Amino acid sequence: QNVYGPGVRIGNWNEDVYLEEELMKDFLEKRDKGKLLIQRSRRLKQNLLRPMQLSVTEDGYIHYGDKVMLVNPDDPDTEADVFLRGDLSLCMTPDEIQSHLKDELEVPCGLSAVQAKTPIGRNTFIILSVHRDATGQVLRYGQDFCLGITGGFDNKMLYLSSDHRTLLKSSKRSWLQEVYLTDEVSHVNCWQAAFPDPQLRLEYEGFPVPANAKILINHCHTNRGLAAHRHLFLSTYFGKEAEVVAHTYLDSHRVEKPRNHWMLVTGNPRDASSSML
Amino acid sequence: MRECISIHVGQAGVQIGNACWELYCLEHGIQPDGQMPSDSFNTFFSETGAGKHVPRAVFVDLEPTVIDEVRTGTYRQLFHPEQLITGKEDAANNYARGHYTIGKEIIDLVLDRIRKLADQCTGLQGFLVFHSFGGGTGSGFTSLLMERLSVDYGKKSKLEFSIYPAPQVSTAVVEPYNSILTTHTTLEHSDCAFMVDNEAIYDICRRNLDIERPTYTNLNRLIGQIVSSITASLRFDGALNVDLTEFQTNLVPYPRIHFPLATYAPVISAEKAYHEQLSVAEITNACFEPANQMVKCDPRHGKYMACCLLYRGDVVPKDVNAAIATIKTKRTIQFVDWCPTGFKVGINYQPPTVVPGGDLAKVQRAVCMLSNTTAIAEAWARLDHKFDLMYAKRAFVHWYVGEGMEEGEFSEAREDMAALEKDYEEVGVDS
Amino acid sequence: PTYRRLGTDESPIWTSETHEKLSQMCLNTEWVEMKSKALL
Amino acid sequence: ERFVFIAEWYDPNASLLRRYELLFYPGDGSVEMHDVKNHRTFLKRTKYDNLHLEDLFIGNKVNVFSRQLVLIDYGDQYTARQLGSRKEKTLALIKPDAISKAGEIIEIINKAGFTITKLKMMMLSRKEALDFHVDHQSRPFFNELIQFITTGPIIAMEILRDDAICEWKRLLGPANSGVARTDASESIRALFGTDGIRNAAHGPDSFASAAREMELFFPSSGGCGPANTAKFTNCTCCIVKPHAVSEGLLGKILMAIRDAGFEISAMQMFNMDRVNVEEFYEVYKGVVTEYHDMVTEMYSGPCVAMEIQQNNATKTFREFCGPADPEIARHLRPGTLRAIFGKTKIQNAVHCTDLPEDGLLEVQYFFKILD
Amino acid sequence: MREIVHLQAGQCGNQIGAKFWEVISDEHGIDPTGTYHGDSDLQLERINVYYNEATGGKYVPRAVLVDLEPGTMDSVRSGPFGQIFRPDNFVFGQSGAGNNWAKGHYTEGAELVDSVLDVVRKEAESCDCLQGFQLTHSLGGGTGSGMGTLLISKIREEYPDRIMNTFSVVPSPKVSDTVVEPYNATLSVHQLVENTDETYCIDNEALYDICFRTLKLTTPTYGDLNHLVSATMSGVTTCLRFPGQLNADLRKLAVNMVPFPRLHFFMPGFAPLTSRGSQQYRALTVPELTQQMFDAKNMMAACDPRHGRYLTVAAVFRGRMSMKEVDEQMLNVQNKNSSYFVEWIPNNVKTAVCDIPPRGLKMSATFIGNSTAIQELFKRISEQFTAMFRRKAFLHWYTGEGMDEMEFTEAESNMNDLVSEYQQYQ
Amino acid sequence: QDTMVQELALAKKQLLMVRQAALHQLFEKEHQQYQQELNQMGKAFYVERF
Ligand SMILES: Nc1nc2c(ncn2[C@@H]2O[C@H](COP(=O)(O)OP(=O)(O)OP(=O)(O)O)[C@@H](O)[C@H]2O)c(=O)[nH]1
Ligand SMILES: Nc1nc2c(ncn2[C@@H]2O[C@H](COP(=O)(O)OP(=O)(O)O)[C@@H](O)[C@H]2O)c(=O)[nH]1
Ligand SMILES: [Mg+2]
Fold it and tell me: Is the CB of residue B235 less than 8 Å from the CB of residue B43?
């Protein structure tokens, strides 16, 4: 009736020792053929979390080709009961099943919001022209530009994209229009920046966008603004992130809600790692 | 998703529900505030849009003396304001006050709260009623609540957690009248009735648990541990899960017999489990000993009918089957001849959790044994003898007759339990 | 040492059983497992 | 005469914190123990040789019969009056300008008698550095001072002695280097100082200030303090043993390492548990003659862990340490650390990693996982 | 929530109520000014039971004070705790009762009850849910036995459902302080047995016996005798106002103690008593409370329980305590003293538990006891009443004011039937 | 998670075997070197045969 464990020469011990030896053999042959799960997912997180530098604006104007970050501001929201606080940032996010299984990044990758202020490999965006070969030119209100993210990979460039909703392709939680990342070049990658004030929108159309200011991002093929939801959370391998959709929110005065506001955050001149905020 | 409604009635019900919902909160990691620091909780904790969980229990009492302690103590923010129902005047240890005059005015509010809580239950398993025989509220109000619940809700399961009078000591004088008059009523409108007392838990906590000076909290924590081990199959995952319907079906052969006995193993302190080996054989031969049952009656006098074992923790079915075979080989346990297969088994993975400042040690495996026996007729015969020896001289009868009932209810309540005694010997006769 | 009280005027008494038991249950000497830090 | 201390032990077999009363009679060096919650005797009046009166202070882990006891408070007013009024506490801070000069400072401290309880090498970032500089908000030279703090690594030490504040201020002397040189001769600042801004040392002046500095550097609440300066590349591990620390040759070990030319990028103080000692020495289990004696010498007292950055100036650090046996070292390689600071084979006062391939795991067990 | 309306009449009832309203002013931490000076928060949760809220945070008692003579109001209003009682709650006449039951029940108490009934009915409807009534008077006097038992009939015909409780000062043979006192004691017993649910008979000789051997007082004045009585009323309603483990209000006690409607005569006891030099040595423990509680010299009535048989026994515990020691101590005294209890009612003992002990103390227990041996007390009155009635002594103070002699011939008949009623169940 | 714990435990076991196997050879080689260096001066390591 007595049991002693894995050291004592009592009862049936030899068969247990043979189980340990065959498990060692199976581990060794899996090591030799390289099917171990510990060897797979090292490089992807390293390239996603490697630090990056940001651009410095001489005149405070958003220029083409500069390295910027997308930051949603902090604003107290009455309509939400449980919601995140502080300034959010837009970051790429693969699915956790894909992160476990495939070492290579897959298309499309989701978008989310993380409370992070330092630039990392997940959230450094380059503002690019739609007809290309344009560098050092002022980005103006009501124009076309693309937000290319390398993701820590020099080989591939990915564009923010969002198409018209169907009965099969929608967001995970809100079931609204959703935004993803695909490498294909089309018109669904072009985004448009506008002034928040509706009365001064048409007057400020065509002026250079200043850095670190509140602007709205609108897709040209939809005119649904990029928005971040705080009362619905996405649980991923990186933790708890906020949902990002493409929808226009208007109050009773028909002005845009603080969900739609965004800043193109640039870097500090003294320290490249620290941002302007 | 599967969920049950807890109804605690009386001072015993409230002071058991305190130490029971404490264990539920600690098992699911629910703070006394009401928020989980971070779906198995949905069996007892209903969600809210703010991430706040509220229980599916109803506390009822005709005096606010203990409900105000609930509303004032550590768990004030957790329970609903309307899930704790109070009256102004107590039943004063009277079945007539509990059933006809004082217990008739708040039954509408209690039924409304039961209906409101049952409407949000997507799939309801049944009701568990925690009460005491020896109290006026816990007899009369529970009887009328059982009647109205059986009229309204048709075929839901009804399980009883009933505090029965101890054979030697008790806390009242008119508890034979109360016990007779409520056991006459609750026979037809109940499905199963787990029975406990106080002297058996006193003896257990003295001999096994090594404190010479116990308390109602020490009793109530063991009762809550037993209830949690009963509902652990619905709450968590295991090899073989039991249900309320399953051990309602698997424990009672006849509609007039719904009286098991509850036993729990192991009960031990933190000092002694450090040294004693806790094996499946020892925790299953702990239950079958007469010194470890929580009803002061000896099963060597009677014959078993059915048994249901619930195992939790690092347990293996091979050793479970070997221990059950050893139990079947051992002779001093007798069984009725018409039940050749007497055992039910349920398996759960999670080992039991202990409370800070607690008394039981942190164990790896545990077992709860619910066994139908014929050796409750002995205690019922003693209570019937006490009832006759009181009723011969017409003592304490004017209190009952001046508040609503007539005098024939006593005669009917004795005659029906005499018939149930006759049915006990008829079932116990070998074929 | 007419008496004005039937004792020696102690005051440790102002607490209740249920509240005091639940208070010790909420706050006591915290025991948690301290897992040994492995090499790998 | 007896001294009573309540002690806490974590029971690994059941995971409970258990409080006992440990009673020490210093006339014969005898220990007795009783149980608090059970009110019964736990251990007879037994003459235990390893435990001394110098090891009895709050925050110390003493190994009584293979149990680690952490003394939490004074037992009664008698031991409070006898010990707490005498033993006092202060904080020693070594500035980045004298990191290479730290060995002489520690050695002069050990002559002065200040018992080191916790030692750490750390780098302050801007937030905790500004929290450090709160009293200096009058801005004499605030930006230069905060830059001087944030450039290099600092050393934080806890030192116990009677009249600790007064004696440490006497050793430090005036803050200005030239003023200290004129006023005194043997001051630490005067001996190893450059100017007023770089005084090479610091210390609190009042009890509340010392408590605030304690809560700033070493959080007793449970929060993580400032990190170390472990680089985790091209380095090996070294251990200064409890007997060497208690004897007071730590400063001589640091000076000998500096004279050899090896660079110590990080170092700190541990008071390790026997489970960690066995997990560390399971590789030596069964391959050396004396395993249990090395384990006991490792967990008997406080350990000092160092990351030695191999500059390959002369040879390997193992070759500098020399043979394991002190007599073999004294007869073959008389210039080695074990030949200088070793008395028997069990206690050699310096431990060095034997396998060159294990340097990364050796540093990462101490300064990454145990950090 | 459950408000207790205290009543007192006569000279003795006024002086007991002056001491009773002192100890629960101490227990609830109420100063003689009228405000609250306490430290805990358990004192204020149930304070409307005994005290009425007013403006400025002033609490006043829900008590009335009645006597036909204004002599005893002056000592009450000028006592240590005299400023708390409301001035409108003193009802006084100008002519004293003078140890005659007829003056208190037919002539001088005839018009005084109309002013009291205005005061009582105002405080009766002020309660949200009235628990019942409580009274303290003297049988050997004129006002307490005269008007007090006249009010008992008049309150009972108004609110029949509410419980009535009585704390009586029954006479004494050797400590007799009145000549004509068997008349006033006999004629009030008839007015008690019909309109009362609980009667606590307190006698004057047993209190002098307790303070001599147990508290060892040299000069046991009335302030010492009233205080042991004053501790009893606090210990019986202790669960109506404080949290506990097993509550027992006034209706809970009457259900267990009273099997038959005429068996409502108790005899009380208070468990923890010891002198100042014996306080620091005797360890106050639950076995020590149990042993002292059942003693014959411990009781507050002039009856020996060894000559009778207990019908039902109640015990209300106070303080922090376990219950296993309580359950086996009540069981051990029931097993060993099997001849001291009746055999037709099993489980003669009722137990109740509270949390808060009395102030200055750590554990306490109040004994309420229904015993057959109360008829020994009533036989001494009845044998004295016949010796006076056979010679028609002192009757011209009674039949000369408007009273028939039939009330004398009938009150001996009811008292004779009750003492023969206890004797059957012995 | 548990699979990763199992694989890490097996890897630690194999690392312990490899480290012991190397440390044996290192200790024996250094013992031989010390024996030769002692015999150079004229003293020898002590081993008893009684
Ligand atoms: N095991 C256990 N039994 C209890 C507890 N509290 C009360 N009881 C039982 O309850 C009985 C007394 O009845 P109560 O529950 O206090 O009162 P009640 O049932 O509401 O009846 P009334 O007071 O007339 O309204 C005692 O005899 C105890 O056996 C408890 O906390 N644990
Ligand atoms: N124990 C006690 N007895 C008292 C007190 N005051 C009066 N008595 C007794 O009451 C008896 C006299 O009662 P009496 O004043 O005539 O009653 P009344 O006429 O109704 O006011 C005396 O025999 C006293 O012993 C008191 O404060 N305590
Ligand atoms: Mg009740």
Answer: yes
